[PDB]
Amino acid sequence: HHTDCKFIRVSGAELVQKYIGEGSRMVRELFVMAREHAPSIIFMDEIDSIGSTRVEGSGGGDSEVQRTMLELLNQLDGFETSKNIKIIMATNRLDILDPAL
Amino acid sequence: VACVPLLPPPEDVAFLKTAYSIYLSQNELTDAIALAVRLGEEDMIRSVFDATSDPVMHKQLAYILAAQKTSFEYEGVQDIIGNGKLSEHFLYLAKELNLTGPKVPEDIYKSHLDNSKSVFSSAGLDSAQQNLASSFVNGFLNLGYCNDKLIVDNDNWVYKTKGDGMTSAVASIGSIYQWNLDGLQQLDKYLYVDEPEVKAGALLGIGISASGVHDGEVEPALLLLQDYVTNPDTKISSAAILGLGIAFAGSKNDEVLGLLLPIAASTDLPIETAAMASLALAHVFVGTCNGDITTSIMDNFLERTAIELKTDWVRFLALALGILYMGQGEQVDDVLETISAIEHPMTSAIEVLVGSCAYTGTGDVLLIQDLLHRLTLAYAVLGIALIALGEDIGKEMSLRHFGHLMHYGNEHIRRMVPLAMGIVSVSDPQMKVFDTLTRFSHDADLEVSMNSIFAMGLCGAGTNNARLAQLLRQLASYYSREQDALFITRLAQGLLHLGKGTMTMDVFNDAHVLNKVTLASILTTAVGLVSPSFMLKHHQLFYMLNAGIRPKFILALNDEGEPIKVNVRVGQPVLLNHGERAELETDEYISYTSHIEGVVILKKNPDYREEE
Amino acid sequence: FVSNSEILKPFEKKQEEEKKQLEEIRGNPLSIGTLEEIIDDDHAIVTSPTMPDYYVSILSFVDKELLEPGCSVLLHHKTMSIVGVLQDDADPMVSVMKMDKSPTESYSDIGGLESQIQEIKESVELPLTHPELYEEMGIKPPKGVILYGAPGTGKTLLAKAVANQTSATFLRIVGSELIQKYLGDGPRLCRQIFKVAGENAPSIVFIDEIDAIGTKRYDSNSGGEREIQRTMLELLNQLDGFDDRGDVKVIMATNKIETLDPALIRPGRIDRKILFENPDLSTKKKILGIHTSKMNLSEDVNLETLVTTKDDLSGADIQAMCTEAGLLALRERRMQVTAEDFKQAKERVMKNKVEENLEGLY
Amino acid sequence: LKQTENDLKDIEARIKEKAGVKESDTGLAHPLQVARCTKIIKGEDAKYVINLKQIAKFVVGLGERVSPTDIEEGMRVGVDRSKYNIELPLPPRIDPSVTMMTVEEKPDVTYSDVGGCKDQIEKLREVVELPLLSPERFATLGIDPPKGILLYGPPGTGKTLCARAVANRTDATFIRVIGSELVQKYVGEGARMVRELFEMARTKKACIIFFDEIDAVGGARFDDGAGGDNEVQRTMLELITQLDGFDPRGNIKVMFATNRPNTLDPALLRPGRIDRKVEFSLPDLEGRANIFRIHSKSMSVERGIRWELISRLCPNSTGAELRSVCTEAGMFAIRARRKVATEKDFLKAVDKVISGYKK
């Protein structure tokens, strides 16, 4: 609200479609949306629980999706050297994290 | 000097001649020679050698001059050293005369090849038609080094093709012998006796062999040819004549003119398909004008008689005026007045060509507009190539000009354009030019397809199979609809991997100036390659493409044969030694004054003397 | 110029007349559909959404070889004739791929990796520099290399540098997203990645952290999860079964190269196996010098001093230090950085990395 | 310029095509999965209307006939998924349908390993090359050759090369299927795909179906269905059904490739499906020399080189590895900025590559 941007909560699993790429596609599209809407907060929803929110992260697609986001961040400081869209992670558990992360 | 013919209208040659004096001051004779070819200053080249009085410099100049051929093969430019070694006044050297009457450049071409190597071939196959293709290609693939033993060995390999095909097969032994003085000896044994196709074809093989080692011969082909002419053999003498014409290229002498001239006035064109010998005179007296040749050509053009209705000589006599007038720019205007005056439909074609040839490598506004008038025929469009290849902007101008030929659908129109692509792009392959050429392949006219594959062979030159492999497979898939196509495709491979794949046809030089000879070679082969291409002729004309050949090389020398290292960064070997091949790169250490590619004497500060 | 004009005057009249004869066909409504297959009688079968399917002869704007089975095409609204080719719609599904044209990074910025930089240069870089050169020689240089260390310390960086030099498209492939929980699904996702790589050559294909789709096991298929095994065999078949000269180069990444099947490594594609050395004192100086060129700082900061007291820090820790000392300056509202900021910064990252468990020593 | 030529080619086709096209419009216009003639103008029962779609069903219960004067109205006369059975106008029986495959008519690949794969070549020649080149020989013996052959051991060490090579040599279509793509979760999506491939094979017969990986398609389990090893088992079982049924053994070859035949079900292994099972041999010293000799028809190696001597210091290697050494040795030549190669460049490359390999 202070930095003057849309707060975008993204549900990790909802970016878990059972078809070819369509899912992989959604992941890519999202980055496209938030690049257009720059600046933006991407808040990675579903590696936390507010009580009314299901799934705190899992061995499926929440930790892997959390790796993907990091990759994107590397690439921006790369070719374009423009970066105005920041990702905020929230977690309660150190079992979703690994030291290179 | 680069700017004057590059950027503006380039009419005035005041600038060029003036630059030449400034070059004397600071002792860049290397740039002074480069100006001196093109303008047609025979005088300058000799005068710069006279100013030189340093042996280091003397031998280094002789090497970089060798590259522009026409002023090295030509007498009293090589023999400035020969006149003045006899009694000293110029400190001309003995080892140096062995450079100027070429032996040692050709020896290091061999040395390079033995050292960094390239593969052998055989393959004669069988059937007459296949044999001739395979025989021709063999000689091209092992050109520039004697490996003719295989051909000689199988007498049946030799035998199988007949008539004028036997003339070629025998003669291919000559292609393998080319650039090598020793190889003349070996040839003699086949020459004597044999079948008459063997006899005749030897003489053609001697003319191919001598192309680039005629200048200071060891076997006198003129004497063998002279004898032959008095002998019956109306037909054979023609091909004999093409070979000696090829042999006598670059130089000029009265002797060759005397043998050729009466043969040209025979009129044995209608029946034998002989009397081509004006073409041969044209090729000997390149870049220079002798009036006897000119008048002969002109009056036989005016005739148009029942004998001279034979359309083959007309293609050659067309070409002939332009080759005699290549490079001489302004002075040619005298010849042009005579030409314009003798009105014919044949002649209008020849106007644009003479002007193209003469202005070659620098186009002008007059020339572009004049060629567009003609267009709205083959010679006007082919001329565009000659002007475009010296010019950066002119290469881009090509895509615009050849647009026109593409917007028409007419079959004639389609067929002409691929030769013109072939002539410009000879130096290095141009991929945008290849995208256009693919389309020209797949047409419902056979003759367009034939010229496209001869064009791909021209354009790919200086390099082997790049994108070309994938094209070379598609060409192969058209043998099944067309007999001609196999032969032409076989020729393309031979050209693409000519002289063991490391030799080129190019307008880049050890002095970075276009070579008048190389241009004429390509031009004359482009119209009239093989019997069903154009007007009925001979397959035999293909050997004329030999004139085109320059080998790629940088050899650094610290002395005269001692090695000195350089590293240069070719295909990925990358970071090669001296004594190898490179293109568009130069030495990383300092020449006497030249700092240029080719056979170079390199010098070091004695404090940080390095030698390999 | 003059050339344009010669052409304009006949070209005009023919163009209008052709443009017209096309537009009478092309007139609306014409439905889009997709070309199923091209039959060899020079017909073609087309799949329409609205349920005509017909065998029709082409009409030009394209040629029969300018079309392939499965292409999108324009269809007539009663005979379903192929008037022209069109470009896919209603969402082409393309798999996660990140495009980086000339990613801004060089060898110079990360110098002191000297030994690795030559290895990647010979194998990857110089073949891409020589395109017609790889076509003529025909023999394989290295197709592919493997880089193994820690990401964003050399592994990410090295591949970014070489991409900048050769003007190749750099393609960052998320190892894990290929880890879809379905069947059939992993290999067709993997295949799609390779399809696009060959189409849009030149490119370097950087496949980030393959171990989630991998895991070697003891058998080449096992009664555990099938999806993880499926993606792995497709990946092994994709190196083994199509080979390139120079048109596509593969850089593979993994933290541990020993969790990969030894036949998925496969010599004769991946010839180079590149590993990570630790910084010595002199490298620490070099890596530090670059990072401070881009800072502004106080002149009481001494590089030599910081370096000596650092021992066993990799470059990642060196980068973190620049940001942490610089953060205390940003807190004090200052765009210099003092000596003091660095000392506290050096000490802290040093402490956390350098955890003791008495496993050193001996 | 490039755009103008390309347009003039289309335009030249377009005028001629438009004329033929108008005429063809007047009555409308071999691969299919359901039959279509969209009404049938032409012709108890004595006229035949076939349109098999879900929307619009014209169901004839009588087949038997050439009647309309051949194919018409949407041209796809052929085979139904409801049995209307348009029998034999322009004979349309057994088709490709819609398949997804990678076809290479006459591969550009020839053997480059003959030293460890001397054995795979001797068997190959006899099973595939000679029955296609002379069928009559086999006939006089009273035998028909193998339907399927399995080649095992490490992939790509000349195993893959032998497959492509025999296809080129016989003038048969080479079809690479990756086995792992023909296995689907989706109900049957997997079984259906398998029927269409063998039918495709039948239409186009005298052809080699190369299956990379049967570890995927079968392979180990203990679960015996599980909601994900059922799906796999259904694909495996359908594949068997085509082989062990009716198939041509003298036209259709299937060559299978695996990395371990010991976790494969006995039904994949057994004759009735795979007759010959050929072993990969890590090459012997003499073997290494011939495969070396092939690569060293390039490179300016020293002349008088003894590959046998180099082979005796080498650890174990596979054909993939021997090629691998040769190109890495050329990397040392460019690295040191020198034209020619020695024995030494090859030794140095061995030393490196084997350690790198290990696990």
Side-chain angles (χ1 to χ4, degrees), chain C residues 76-148:
Chain C
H76 189 280
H77 62 294
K78 294 181 178 179
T79 61
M80 300 297 172
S81 296
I82 300 171
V83 300
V85 63
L86 179 65
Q87 182 177 29
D88 290 347
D89 61 6
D91 294 333
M93 295 181 287
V94 298
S95 67
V96 65
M97 295 177 287
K98 177 71 176 176
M99 180 181 287
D100 183 329
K101 184 179 179 180
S102 199
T104 300
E105 183 64 64
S106 67
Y107 74 90
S108 66
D109 293 335
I110 59 169
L113 297 175
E114 182 66 20
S115 179
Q116 293 83 330
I117 292 168
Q118 184 65 27
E119 290 176 350
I120 196 168
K121 181 178 179 180
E122 290 177 16
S123 65
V124 176
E125 182 177 0
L126 291 173
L128 292 173
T129 299
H130 298 82
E132 291 178 340
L133 291 173
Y134 71 62
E135 291 177 323
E136 291 177 17
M137 292 179 182
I139 192 168
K140 298 292 183 179
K143 183 175 180 180
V145 299
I146 298 170
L147 299 175
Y148 63 92

Side-chain angles (χ1 to χ4, degrees), chain D residues 102 139 165:
Chain D
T102 301

